[PDB]
Amino acid sequence: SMSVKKPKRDDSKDLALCSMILTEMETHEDAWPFLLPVNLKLVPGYKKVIKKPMDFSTIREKLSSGQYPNLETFALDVRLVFDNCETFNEDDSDIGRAGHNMRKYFEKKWTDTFK
């Protein structure tokens, strides 16, 4: 509350660490569905069904240009990429499997880096 602060967690390496995690996701072999925005002219249903499209390149731009206020807002966008995938793709599809694999990969790196 006013003049009463919890001890200061060092957040000064978070930008760099999130960049590193993002790099590891960009270079995973199953990142291909997620590297670029879905082409909303060429994929029927995508625009209407997926209210908040997200992809790795868009996340990379936001990170590089100070559009994440903190590491939680970063993790929200990465989870959004995998939540969207689950919404639009059957679990038993190559894309659907890719998404489950990537989410598992992300969450481990996130826990190990910050928890």
Measured in residues, the chain has a length of 115
Angstrom resolution of this structure:
2.0
**7, 14, 113 from 34: Cα distances, Å:** 38, 23, 22
Tokens 């930008």 correspond to 15
CA–CA gap between residue 106 and residue 97 (Å, rounded): 14
Tell me which fold the domain 1-115 belongs to: Histone Acetyltransferase; Chain A (1.20.920)
Q: How was this structure determined?
A: X-ray
How far apart CA 82 and CA 73 sit, in angstroms, is 15
Burial of 95 (0-12, 13-18, 19+ CB in 10 A): middle
DSSP 45-100: THHHH-SS---HHHHHHHHHTT--SSHHHHHHHHHHHHHHHHHHS-SSSHHHHHHH
Q: What angle, rounded to 10 degrees, do the helices at 56-64 and 14-26 form? A: 160
